[PDB]
Amino acid sequence: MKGDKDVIDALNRLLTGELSAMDQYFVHAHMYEDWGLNELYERIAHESDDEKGHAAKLVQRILFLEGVPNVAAREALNIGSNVEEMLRNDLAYEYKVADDLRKVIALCEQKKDYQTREILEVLLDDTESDHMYWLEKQLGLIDRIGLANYLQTKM
Amino acid sequence: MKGDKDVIDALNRLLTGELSAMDQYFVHAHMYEDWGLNELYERIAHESDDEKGHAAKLVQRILFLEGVPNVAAREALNIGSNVEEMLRNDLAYEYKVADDLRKVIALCEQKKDYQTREILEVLLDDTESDHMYWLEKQLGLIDRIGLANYLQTKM
Amino acid sequence: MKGDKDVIDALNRLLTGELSAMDQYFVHAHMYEDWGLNELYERIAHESDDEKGHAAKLVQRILFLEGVPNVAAREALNIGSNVEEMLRNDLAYEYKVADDLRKVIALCEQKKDYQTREILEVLLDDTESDHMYWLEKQLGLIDRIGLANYLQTKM
Amino acid sequence: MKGDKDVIDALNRLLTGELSAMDQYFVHAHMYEDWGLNELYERIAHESDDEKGHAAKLVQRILFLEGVPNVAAREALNIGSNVEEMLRNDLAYEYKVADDLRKVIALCEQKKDYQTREILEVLLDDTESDHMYWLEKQLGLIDRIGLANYLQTKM
Amino acid sequence: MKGHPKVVGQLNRVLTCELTAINQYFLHARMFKHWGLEKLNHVEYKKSIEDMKHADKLIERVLFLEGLPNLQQLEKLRIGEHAQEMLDCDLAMVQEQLTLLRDAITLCEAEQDYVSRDLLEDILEDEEEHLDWLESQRELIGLTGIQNYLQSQISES
Amino acid sequence: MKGHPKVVGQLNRVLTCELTAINQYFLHARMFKHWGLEKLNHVEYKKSIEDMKHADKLIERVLFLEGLPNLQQLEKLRIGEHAQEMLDCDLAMVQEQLTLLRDAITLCEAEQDYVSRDLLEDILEDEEEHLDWLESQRELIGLTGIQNYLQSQISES
Amino acid sequence: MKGHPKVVGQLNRVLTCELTAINQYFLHARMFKHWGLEKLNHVEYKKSIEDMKHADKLIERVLFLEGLPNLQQLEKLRIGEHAQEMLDCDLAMVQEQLTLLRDAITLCEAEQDYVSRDLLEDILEDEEEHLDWLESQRELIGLTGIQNYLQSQISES
Amino acid sequence: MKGHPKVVGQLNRVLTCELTAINQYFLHARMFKHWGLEKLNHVEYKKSIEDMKHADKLIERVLFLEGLPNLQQLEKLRIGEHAQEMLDCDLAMVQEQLTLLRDAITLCEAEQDYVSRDLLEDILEDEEEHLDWLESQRELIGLTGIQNYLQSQISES
């Protein structure tokens, strides 16, 4: 079908976001593995895979809506140097993705594009209930047990 | 059968206690899960389920004794803000439940209501040998290894 | 994340509703079991368990949104004395829960809190398609076969 | 270990190449799926996954060599509009990757970095014996049976 | 172990009453089978088997306490003519037997016979579960009527 | 639950259109089977089964909302003579039915009928997956030609 | 094979009536489900599935005979308000449809269309087994009463 | 991919030598089978199969490099009359072929043909494992004598 032009633009911005998330989670997972923190490596790598799944869904939706997916553009990556900084960068970036997803869900509701709305609602449900919540839990655990105890659990 | 009026009143007070215990263990388990402390979440959630089982037994006994179970009344919940406070509140409340169970077991013995006595004896055995003992062990472990080591084991 | 203050208030009112539903379904299931009506006992007990699941989801959402779940407050329970009255009280209370869920879904849509919207939409789907529909079917069956035939099927 | 600075630069250029390959194969696979050409979709998607595996190996090697992987930079994507153009763009880009891999293998041999040499030799073996060969076969088949017969086999 | 004479007397009286219960429950189960009410048959038969186990435990306890089990005496049987009357007779017998069990548990506690008391408490919980079942049946007859209630007993499962 | 009259009217209109879709898809599937195009048969038959499930859900929703399902009315069927015409008729009907579904979802949201809206959103995603498939088939006919495309439909799997 | 125009017309009329039967049976099955009568749901649903298979066979036969299946027309639906009325409407429709099938079998024999006749004879045996079932249900309502009969339909198995 | 002419020439020469090896190893395996030396049969046959796989890989590499595989030319075969002579001929051919492989690996490295080099390195490790086996056999003949050594080859396993 012929999708709304604004809906395709917003879907393409969400795609740029998901692809940047994929890159950041990829390099962070491998920085965790380089440090022997295999549990964080595995968690962040699976989150990069989920970002790849979200990007696949967005690309499929943009192509179905007869748009041109933009997989070339990338947002600036915020790579941390230590575990707390990388977790806080992942959290900042999940917050930005959730905000942008909410804006696009509102737009899809105004533009009557309900099916894009539920695709983005599944994406927002993953962003909130899968990894924003996990990151907030991790930062709270660092606050409770300390960073050295927290990192000991991640090996 | 027609149960003694005092025995039904005491069973209803025990029911109020068990229902308040259920609510407190429920909110505490979920506060533990919100903090990434999944082992405490699971333990306290299973204890809320055991409180639900005790309340079911008490309601069945009150109905068999031709009384009216009071599931509307609730005691004041003592919700903690940090792990030690929630464990100490659960311990205080288990102590109160055990005291009240002993009073009602004495009453059931005076009123010849032996079967209510063994129902409450099973309840008291759970209260003591299942979670009062566990809470005392947990507070002793916090005293031995420290709170940051203790919370690290609970993730 | 930091949820909207009105969304947390509405989620807490929904939580009070779900907890009162749990209590009412609990005492009604046990009143059905006391009368030998084991099929109603089992159905209403499973509905009390579903109310507990809904309350768990609401508590998790309120804690994620950095609110304080209120598991202490309870609405007035409307306990019936005979089977038709308890079924009609359960239906009245399901109607009230569905109305209040619709109001909160509208509020979550206005407040851009889409994820709370889908949590409450799953809750509303259960409330309508799981037990409001069942209760209406039961009252229609009582109207068709009579109360003595209806109760005979519930043993 | 501390890798040679030139070897890390060359590994990072290979990483940029692999990541651009991933993006191009991703959008091409989905453009094939949008057209009902499911066999090309599946083949090109698996090749995007192999590019992700190569990029993972390169990132792991750059981190082991105490370098900073650059997952932010991306080369210009050459997206085709019809099947022959996308196959020819994938072939051009595989040719460029193979040339650049050979240059870096020569550099790793001069810099005594033998282990990077075998990592890149496995990458070059995949690039040649897995998908450059496949693309040349596909273009030869288009030349032999025609484009309409070729596309019929790809559904 | 030489038991208290009062405890052995109470156990022998509970035994008389358990044997009377066995006989009444079996007669009622077979009267129910004769009428085609099979689920009532099954319930009354498993209840007679249960009182059979109870009498076995009481005999073994009276023998361990160096007493003489009295299997010769039986109480008067209340045999009903129809289902409701039979259920009421069963109810009356369960209630009398529960009063007896409570008196015996009180006496066993007064004599520090605590394993006799544990035995009698198991018998009490069983008899009072059957009391619950009989009260459920009476409520079901009041709710669905006797014809609907009896129709539910035709098939054993 | 007493539903809104507007929502029940919209659901009944979506039901009319789902029934028309069932009939058109089955006629087209059997016209395809008659020509030996078996994979097109299979697709159109599973699509008619899918619209069958959709009509079932709409009937159940209209009944739950205390409305009267209208299974009597059907829309005009667009039956093609050849494969391309049949696929175009299917496309036109999917597009009309998607417009209808979007209007009904808008109205269901305006009336706070959120489970009706969830129902209609499932129907929308299904209808729009079939729209995707039909557009894929048209692109494949444009790419491989109609004779090559029809040759790929001879075998069902 | 080019079939007789009269045989194709009769098959198209039997098809109209089979489609009307599908719609009426499904509406009635879902009205029964809405009332909690689950075994009546199950029967009416499997009967609608059966008339679905019948319509499929008639469409395939009309297509093989180089005719045009008419899935557009439907007859008037008799939708009842309560169980007895719905069963009577189903009975009336089965009887009308059996008369139609007998006329079509007679015509198929007169035109030496013997595989059309075999098709219609399978449809006849199925429709007349459902006629038997509906008459059984009416006799059961007369025997046990409508309240007892409806109580037997609450559970699907 | 268009390969270097020198690399394709070297691969074609290694291919000629691999084909000559296949022929010599098979003739020797069947000469061993004809004498009842079954374990020597088995070794020489699996070695001919191995050089068969090597020739397959070289043909595929020469084809991928847009060259023309030369399966027409073969080198002179050294066929022995007795076991020791056949093993010495096999040894001489393995040594010549290893020298050739080393020259080809050097040239492939000089031309940055690294997958050709990996191919040739697999062929080198295989040929040099067989060189090891042949040297082991010569040492075993020197240790146990030719009559004892040949007696150990009678049974294949």
Ligand code: HEM
């Ligand atoms: C002193 C009186 C009695 C005692 C202590 C006694 C005890 C028992 C016990 C322990 C069992 C086996 C239960 C099991 O393991 O499942 C049994 C079985 C049975 N009893 Fe009795 N019983 C008594 C009298 C009677 C009477 C009076 C009747 C019938 C008129 C009766 C009928 C049966 C039947 C039919 C069985 C099943 C047979 C079997 O075990 O296979 N009993 N009894």
Ligand code: HEM
């Ligand atoms: C031209 C009219 C129709 C024809 C020829 C037809 C044919 C069929 C056939 C052959 C089946 C599969 C039966 C089986 O293998 O068990 C089926 C399934 C079904 N039909 Fe229809 N049908 C028609 C119209 C309808 C209508 C109007 C409805 C509802 C309003 C409906 C509802 C269903 C349902 C719910 C199913 C079950 C889905 C499934 O097979 O899993 N059908 N139909």
Ligand code: HEM
């Ligand atoms: C250009 C020359 C040749 C090439 C490239 C070649 C290649 C092959 C290959 C790849 C196999 C299958 C190996 C496996 O998968 O286990 C095979 C099998 C075989 N070869 Fe050759 N071969 C050649 C010449 C010969 C000659 C000259 C003979 C005999 C005089 C021979 C005898 C056999 C036998 C007996 C088999 C076993 C049959 C089977 O695979 O089931 N080969 N060959």
Ligand code: NA
């Ligand atoms: Na530690």
Ligand code: NA
């Ligand atoms: Na009845």
